[PDB]
Design a protein around this nucleic acid. Sequence first.
RNA 1: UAAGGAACUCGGCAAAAUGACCCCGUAACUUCGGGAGAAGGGGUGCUCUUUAGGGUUAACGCCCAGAAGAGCCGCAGUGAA
RNA 2: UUUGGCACCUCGAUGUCGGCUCAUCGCAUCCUGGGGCUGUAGUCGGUCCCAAGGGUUGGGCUGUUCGCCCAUUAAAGCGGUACGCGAGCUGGGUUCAGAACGUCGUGAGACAGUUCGGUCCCUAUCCGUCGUGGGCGUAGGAAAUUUGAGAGGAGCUGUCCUUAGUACGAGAGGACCGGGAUGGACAUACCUCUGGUGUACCAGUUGUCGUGCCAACGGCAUAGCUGGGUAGCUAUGUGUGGACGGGAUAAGUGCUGAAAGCAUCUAAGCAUGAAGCCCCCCUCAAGAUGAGAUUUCCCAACUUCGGUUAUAAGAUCCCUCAAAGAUGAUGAGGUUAAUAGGUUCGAGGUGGAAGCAUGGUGACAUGUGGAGCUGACGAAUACUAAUCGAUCGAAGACUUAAU
Lengths: 215, 48, 114, 122, 120
Amino acid sequence: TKGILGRKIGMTQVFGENGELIPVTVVEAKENVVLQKKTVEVDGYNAIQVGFEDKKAYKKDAKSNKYANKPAEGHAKKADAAPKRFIREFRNVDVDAYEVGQEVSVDTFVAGDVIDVTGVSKGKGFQGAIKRHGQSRGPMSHGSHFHRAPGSVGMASDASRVFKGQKMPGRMGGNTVTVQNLEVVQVDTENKVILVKGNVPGPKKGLVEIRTSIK
Amino acid sequence: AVPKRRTSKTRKNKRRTHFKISVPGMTECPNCGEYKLSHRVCKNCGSY
Amino acid sequence: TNHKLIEAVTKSQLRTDLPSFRPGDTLRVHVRIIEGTRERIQVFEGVVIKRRGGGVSETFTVRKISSGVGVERTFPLHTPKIEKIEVKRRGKVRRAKLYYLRSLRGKAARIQEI
Amino acid sequence: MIQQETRLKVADNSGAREVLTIKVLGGSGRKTANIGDVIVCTVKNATPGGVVKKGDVVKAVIVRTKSGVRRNDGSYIKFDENACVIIRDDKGPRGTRIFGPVARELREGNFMKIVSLAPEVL
Amino acid sequence: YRKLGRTSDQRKAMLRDLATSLIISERIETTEARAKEVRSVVEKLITLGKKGDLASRRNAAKTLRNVEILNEDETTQTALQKLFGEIAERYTERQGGYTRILKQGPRRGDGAESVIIELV
RNA sequence: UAAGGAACUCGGCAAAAUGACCCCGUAACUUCGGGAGAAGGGGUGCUCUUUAGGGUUAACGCCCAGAAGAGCCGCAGUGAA
RNA sequence: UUUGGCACCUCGAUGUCGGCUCAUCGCAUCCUGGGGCUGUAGUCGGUCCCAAGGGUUGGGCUGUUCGCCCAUUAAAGCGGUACGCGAGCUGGGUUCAGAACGUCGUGAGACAGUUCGGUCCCUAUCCGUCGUGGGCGUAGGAAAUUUGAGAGGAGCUGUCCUUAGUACGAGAGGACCGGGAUGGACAUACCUCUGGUGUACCAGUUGUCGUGCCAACGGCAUAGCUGGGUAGCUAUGUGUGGACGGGAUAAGUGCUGAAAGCAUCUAAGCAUGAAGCCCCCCUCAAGAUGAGAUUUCCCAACUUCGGUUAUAAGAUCCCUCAAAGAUGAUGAGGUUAAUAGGUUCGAGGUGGAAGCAUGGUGACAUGUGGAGCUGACGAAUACUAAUCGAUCGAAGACUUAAU
C-alpha cells in the first residue's frame, strides 16, 4: 500500500537514538492528489493515479511545459484539481481506500516504515568499458599499447560473429532503478518532507516514487 | 581499411538521403530591405 | 521556498552550548564511552587541527601524542556523545588546516599562545 | 588498510621489531586488513635474545593503523603508524608488555589480554 | 564557464584585451562565444568603477590594459581613467545590465556567428 | 593522488628519487696511481650590531663577507629553472 | 583433446608457444555438496541424481603449453571454442643476418647442445558485430494521457554467532529446525561523512622584465613552486540487494494395489521429494508493418465534399539554457513573458586586506575588524532573444453482416 511522489532535495545526516549517525535523504512530497481510479471492470487492472506538482492554468499561445494544454486541463478537471507536473500510477494500494480528488499526504508514512524508492539515475553520457562495466585495464608500461580498450570480442571461425549482449562502450546513465528496503527516519508534516535513510537514485530535484516495500 | 566490394549506385544514393540542407528561417523585414535571418538584425538589410 | 528544508529539518539537532574555537586552540573534549557495563566519560585533549563543513555536517579534528604515537580524532561538532568542550589555550597560527604538524615532534611541533 | 607486503612495527616485547604481512585471513580474495584483523606475517627484524626469531612465520593482530576506523557515531580515529602484536592462536599475546595506545575495537574480537596490558585504550 | 579554444593563460589574456577594447570603443564586434564571456568581465569592471575608491581602482588595474585614448579636444586619458571617470557616471543609477549583444550573420571565412557587443 | 611500496613484469621497462655551493668524514682492495664525489653527516632567507676580513681598503663606508653574536618571518630559505 | 593418411584447396601467404584483456558454445563436476542410497557411528569412503544455477585465490620459482613449494580458501575442469582470442595488446620462448663455448667435419661449415644481442603494418567498406536518431506505417480527423505476448534481459555465491553438546556417538567429536555479523561480487545507487581531484578561488614565496621611483600590481619561468580548497566528477567512502515462497519435477522414500489367483512404489490411483525448471528488478514494451487499453478537438463557401486556398489539434522552425548531451534526442523555458541565463544585491562555503595609526634602530609586530571570492550553491530584474513573426496539421473509411 502507501505510495507517494516527491522531489529529492539533497542529503544530510541526523543523530539517532544513542548517538548513532544516520545519513539521510530529504524528499519533499508536496501537493499530491488522486487523479484517477482504474478498475478491473473498465481497464482490467486495479490502480490509482496520482499527480504531483501543480503547474499553471492553460493559457492561449504558450510555448513551454509550465502551462497545461487543453487535454491536461480536462483531465485534472474531472477531479477538482489543478494541472500537475508529473503523473504516475500506483498498483500496490487498495483502490477502495482512496477518492478521486483527495490529497495524498506525507503522514501516510510513519517513522519506521520500510520503503522502496524509484527514480531515474543520474546520467553520464558516452562512457567506455572501464567505467561503464567493471573492466580492468591493460598494463600501463612494459611496451603495452593496450590501455582502456575492451579485450577480444569473440572467438574465431567458430561463431564467426559477436554474441548479443557483449559489453561494449555506449551511453551510461539514466535508467530507472529502485533500491529496496530503505526506511523512513522521520516525517515532517509542516514542511511536508520525508527523511529516508540512505541515498536514492537521481539528480537533485528529480522525481522519486516511494512505495511500501514488499519483502 | 579496405572495401571488399565496390558499392553500387543504389547503395551510395541510399546512404545520401539524410545528407542534405535544411531550409532557413526568414523573419521578414517590415521596415525596409531584404529579408533577414531569424532573430537577427542581419548584416545585409536588417530591420528587425 | 525550497532552499531551507535541509536547514529547517535539521535545525533541531544543532547544539548551542558549545564554545567558540579556532584551529590552533587546545581543547579538552569530554566524551562519553558506553561500554555494556556503564556510561563512563573520558577526556581527549589536544590541538585542533581541522574544522570543516556547515550545519549538522560540521566536523573537527584534534591531535595529541599519546606514548610517542600521534593520535588524531575527528568528531561531528553537534554530536550527542560529546558531553562538554573546554577551550584551554588559544593558539596563534597563520593557516586554516594545520597538516604540517603531522611530520613534526617536540619543540618543532609547539604552538605559540594567544 | 594493510595488504600483502606491508611492513608493520611490532608493538610488544616478544622480540620482533618489524614484520611483513603474507596473508590477510578471512575469505577468498580478501584484499585489505584493518584494526582488529588477524594477519599472518614474517619477522624481518628481531631483537637479540627474545622469543621470536628472524624468519619465523607468526600471526598477529593489528592495533593502530594509519588509516584508522570509523565508529558508529560517525567519529573517526587515526594513528600515525601501523603496528601489530604477535598472538598465540588463542588471542593471547606472546610478549608481556604492549607499547603505545591501542584502539577500542580490540574488545570486540575478545583480545582482552591485549587491551588490559596496553597503556590507555583509545 | 567557457574555454574558448585556448589555454588558461591565453584565455585570460584574450579576455583582458577584449574588455579593454570595449572600454576604448564602446561597441565591438566579435564571435558569439567570446562576447558571452566578456559580458561578465566588463560588467564586474564597471561595478568596480562605480564603487570608486582606491582599493577598487587597484583591483581594476589588474585587468585593464595600459592603453592611451586620444580624446576630443585633443586630450588623453588612460582606460582606467575613462572607466572611473566617464563610464561610471553613466551607470550610477542603473543596477546591472550595462551591455547589450546584437547578432549578425555568419562570417565569410568560417560560418562563425558574428555579434556586436555594446555598452548601453 | 588516500593506504600500501616492486605485490607489476621476461626484466624495477618507464617514472619517481639524487643533483649546485660550503663544512665535516670516508671501507675492502690495489699494479701505490687509485678506489673516491666511496659510503655517510651537517649547513644555506632577511635585519641589526662588529671585532674584521676578500679588503672596495683610503676603512669600518664600496659589494661580498672575516665569520662571530643578537634578532625577525614562513609549511618550506641553492624557496623558480 | 601426442601418431597413421595426407594431400582431400592453401609455393598469386589460413600469423607459431606462453602471458594479458574479454568471454562463452556451452559439457563425465572441485565447492555448496542441493538432495539421496549403501561392505554409510558422527568423520570418512563409495555410488546415484543434480548441476557448467552460482562460485571457483594471492605469491616464490621457468624456456615454453610441463612442473614445484609458501600462505590461504567452502573450494581450486573440459577442451574442441583455428591447442578460443596478435585488422584487441605484449614478443619472454623459437628463428633471420653478429659473436662465443662443447662436440663433429680436411675444409666451407654443421648440431639444435648451450650462450649474449636483435624493426611486427592497416583511416573499417559490399558486408557481417553495442549505443543513439530521421521516415515508410500509419484507418475516424487528429492530438495528450498505459499493453504485458514475450525477442526478452538481469542467473548471483558463501563463511563465522544463539537453539542444542540435546540427539548420533562408548566418549571424543557432534545435528536437523529456528533466532546475529562477515568475504567476494557489486545488481547496484549516491556524495551526508572520510579521502582524491579541482588550470577563471584564497594565501605564501624565488628569479627576471615592465608600469618614470616607492608601494602595490602585472607578464614569463610545468598552473613557476608551495599550503589549503567550493561546485562537479569520484573509491579506498556511505547505503541497499542475494538464504523469495509457491507450483511441477530428478535420484529416492512411500501408501494403496492388482496383474503374475501371493507378494510387490506401478500397470490404474494417491502422497512426498533438490541451489536445478516455471511465477513478485529492468528496456521494447502495434514495429506484437496481424497494427492492444484509459481526456481535448473536429467540420467548406463551394466540394465526383475528392480535391484548391484553406480554415481548423496540438506540434515545430528560431531564441535563453541544464539535472540532459558526440550530434541529434531528453528536460527547464521565451515579448501577461524573468522564463532561463547573465547582472546586481545576497547569503552559504573557501582563504586576513588597502589605507591610517601605534610600537620597534631595523627586519617586522599589533590595532582599526572574518577583506577577497561567489568559478560552478536565493531575491530583484527585462540586459537577453522571438521584429509584423512565419510554417506544418480534416472533411471519418468502405464493405460485409451483426442494432
